[PDB]
Symmetry: C3
Subunit: 390 residues, 3 copies
Amino acid sequence: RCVGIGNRDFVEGLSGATWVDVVLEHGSCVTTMAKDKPTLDIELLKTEVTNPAVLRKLCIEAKISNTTTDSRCPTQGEATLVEEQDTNFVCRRTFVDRGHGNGCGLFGKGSLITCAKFKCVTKLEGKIVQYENLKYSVIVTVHTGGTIATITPQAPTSEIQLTDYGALTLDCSPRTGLDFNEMVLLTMEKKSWLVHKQWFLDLPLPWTSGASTSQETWNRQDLLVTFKTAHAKKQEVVVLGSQEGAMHTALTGATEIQTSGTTTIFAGHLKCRLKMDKLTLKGMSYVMCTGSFKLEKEVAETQHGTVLVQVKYEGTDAPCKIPFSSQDEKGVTQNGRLITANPIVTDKEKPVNIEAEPPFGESYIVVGAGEKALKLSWFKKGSSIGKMFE
Amino acid sequence: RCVGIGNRDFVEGLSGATWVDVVLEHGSCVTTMAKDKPTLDIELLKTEVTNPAVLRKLCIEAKISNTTTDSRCPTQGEATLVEEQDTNFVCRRTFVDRGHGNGCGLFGKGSLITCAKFKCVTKLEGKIVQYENLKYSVIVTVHTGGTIATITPQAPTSEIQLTDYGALTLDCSPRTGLDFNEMVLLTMEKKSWLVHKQWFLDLPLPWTSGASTSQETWNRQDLLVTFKTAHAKKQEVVVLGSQEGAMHTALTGATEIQTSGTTTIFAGHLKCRLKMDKLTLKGMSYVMCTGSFKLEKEVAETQHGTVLVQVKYEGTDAPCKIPFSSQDEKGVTQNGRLITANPIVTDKEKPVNIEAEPPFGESYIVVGAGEKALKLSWFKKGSSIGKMFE
Amino acid sequence: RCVGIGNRDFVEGLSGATWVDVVLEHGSCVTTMAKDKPTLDIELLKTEVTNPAVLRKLCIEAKISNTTTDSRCPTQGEATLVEEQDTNFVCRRTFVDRGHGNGCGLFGKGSLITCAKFKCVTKLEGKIVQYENLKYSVIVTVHTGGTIATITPQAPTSEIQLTDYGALTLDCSPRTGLDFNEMVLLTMEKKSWLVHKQWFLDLPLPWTSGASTSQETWNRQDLLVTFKTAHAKKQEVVVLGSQEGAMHTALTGATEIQTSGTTTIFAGHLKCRLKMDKLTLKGMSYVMCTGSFKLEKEVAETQHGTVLVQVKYEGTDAPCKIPFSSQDEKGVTQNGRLITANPIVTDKEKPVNIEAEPPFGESYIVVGAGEKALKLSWFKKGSSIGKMFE
Ligand SMILES: *[C@H]1O[C@H](CO)[C@@H](O)[C@H](O)[C@H]1NC(C)=O
Ligand SMILES: *[C@H]1O[C@H](CO)[C@@H](O)[C@H](O)[C@H]1NC(C)=O
Ligand SMILES: *[C@H]1O[C@H](CO)[C@@H](O)[C@H](O)[C@H]1NC(C)=O
Ligand SMILES: [Cl-]
Ligand SMILES: [Cl-]
Ligand SMILES: [Cl-]
């Protein structure tokens, strides 16, 4: 089940250490073996975001109450309410017709002020992932027939003592992929999505800072509140309905994600350096596969410019290296664009996930060699920050 | 033409691989050679940004039409137009004098509402560069007397098969320089610039999200529209002229960039690790140059704290290493601040580009050794996000 | 005083170079030694941010003057002032009661406009740290019984010539910790803090772009200015007091930082690669400490998810490696979360600083082995962008 480490991925020093490169991906696991010692496996078990900070909260369903109105006859100056100075209140000033029929000695315009109490009933939250929120669990196993290392952006290193191998340092970083500088965690009711940051910040709903407070205070309440036409002494204030449906539609296409409580689970990717004492490893070689591949399922698209391809091998020579190619609209082999580190069929009866990054526009993905090759045409659309909330 | 790889930039393992460090820069090319094998050259051919997402669009020239006005006599309540609920329309409410001369039984203030249709005629776009938008083409050549690798942030690796050398992995990353988290691609008409992000976001023009929509809807239309003084029954609405000229002036100093269609070409920089099978490379040594250097052209300034210096060598001992130094206002040699990886005169008749990062304030750049040295004084101003749009 | 380099942290090539990993932290210093050569020490001396760009300036104390009012009798149209078109002026329109007692032939509402000149008296500035603003001074010493390298994000490399060791390349990067994409430098009067970016951008004070200008022009002046109730011909305009006190309270908990002029000093952290010519280094081993540790001071908390622990060793076997562990609320050893690279007691009478990154929630920190161990319970609160400015 593990992919063996190739001799290009390590150096034994004449003196000093043996240094080893590995890439860990959800699912995959990597293995190597030293001069007469037990097998060594490494594997990424999970990737979690925990307790991310709120950027802003937004209101998708508001309620209105305590509607108060003050009005004054044309010769009686500007109307005033004390709730004008209350930030729980949303207020509006006008002038209305006044005259004999409503208590005034003159026909003319009278001042009017109306204030109502705004309450958010249903809100959503946009949350930022910082370095302190990301965590990876990496399990390292010596096959005397396991130790779970915790890796974080600020604590990328874990020194671990192994039977027979000795002290082994794991020095791991996240692979380049999802960018938490640009993507925000959006949580509405019970579901979550990854959305672009300015998309979120520019949403036209009442909003409040994520900052620490005792007194929740909304900005842009007007976006959900409608003051109806005023009468001499009274004016109705109304509220829009819930915008959960408008938000659901605007989020169409955004990646949904699974979060229990304050924890969100990702499909992580790590690049690691292993440092151990000077030691001669047994590098593992693989011949290019020679048989055919079928698509175990449809080519899936990520929201950050990649595609995931899962294939099944039909040939006889596993374990072997999967021949992979990308060609742009016009046949040019690209000699790159393969994201998966270890494109290896280690088990003929296990499907193999391959991630790759197609050119923009029309292109072709090719797995396998020769005429036996699976050829798939792909169209990749230019980048977008999301769909407009209406 | 290529700079040879020095023995400090590789290790051959006692076992495992040979690992090699190289830095690739536009222009330069690097070379090395193994125990009785053909020469090996690597070179970065181009760097492209393709199809970046729109953050916002901004309106620099608007037009107005369908101006409609409703007015009511003092005793006839609030004026209303259905276009008040139309987001293509920009509206304004007031009260105006009404009386016998314009159909009203009373002298007093009458309600008035005016709505006009806003259209953007000329817009600009600010676009964000994400990882999926960046691409590098690297050509690798074996001198039997070439293979073009594609490298991207998410797919930094390219395995390539070479004559005599075997399987060679290119593992490349962008060098630290331009920061696409901070700098935005601004496109107005046919020209483009790199501008700071908050500079852009805080521009005082009507704007609309880059988000996907069928119905273009502007925010802050007031910034280009002027409602003139209202009359009893009518009111003119006017629009500012084009702000292309104000934008051109505010962009003064911002780096202009070349973009055909959705592609923008950069002068890229890559740091690479080459991994190949255990092999003894022939490391190349260079003596410090001993002759003199002339400036083939004026010292050029970037907008991110560097300067580019291109020099010509006048001495006899090429290929050789160019002695370089930086001293702060008060003579302190800085032992650093040289950005160029391979400051090598490989060809006496080719000029050499050198990039360096001066201290802030007054300093000196020094190329060459001794009294034969070229000494240049430099002033570097503190950082700025740009000039104010007025 | 220096921590010796372990044999896991270097490789001597069979051919090519000797490559060495080191982590440099304020305080610590690292050392190694080659086959019959003088000792070699490296140490980070300082970390400075110099001349960061202004994002926005915000006004915390404003002043008002040149209050002008125009008013018109009910039958005399809309009031107007030329300062309405002056961006130094803040203006407000209404209608007021007019009648025989103030010069008008009719009782009714008359137009009124009031304009006052806004001036900021006390401002604050939020500043962004870019790559060109960060600098590290690294001193390298050969013990014949020192050369100061300058390292920056864009110029991470420094080639230095040493007695006996030869040419030595320092290739250094900042460790993952403070994130200048997210944290902004806030300067009010003479103090500075690190604050979150959106916290700052969403502050409710009058603001102006950091962009280059001759004419300082504020947005959202209303936030400090109060137009009092208008009279027939006059209206007072007033200004809030200074908000320095409200800002001081809202900044409660934000990290304060020391800045003289345009320079801000940090407690930096660097990860370095040393490249020198092929050479057999003397790797240094340390046994795990066996004695006890006391807390020389209280466990300190950073604002980015770490804690600093300084301990004193009471045992007899220095220099030795400090046994460190973290367990989550329920006893699980985490095999990671240690940030300090070289957790070494090199001197029994010097305290040792240890930085670590606890799980969120309840956990335990453990220094020392066995029953002699110091066991400390910790609670870590979820992330926050700061406290609400009220
Ligand atoms: C008005 O709302 C309720 C009546 O429904 C009353 O008890 C409450 O104290 C008032 N709230 C405010 C702030 O007006
Ligand atoms: C008004 O504008 C044109 C007349 O120029 C008319 O044909 C069009 O349908 C109207 N548009 C709106 C929305 O008022
Ligand atoms: C008004 O303010 C002062 C009087 O205090 C006067 O000298 C100045 O020129 C005027 N400024 C403006 C712009 O009104
Ligand atoms: Cl009436
Ligand atoms: Cl009239
Ligand atoms: Cl009166």
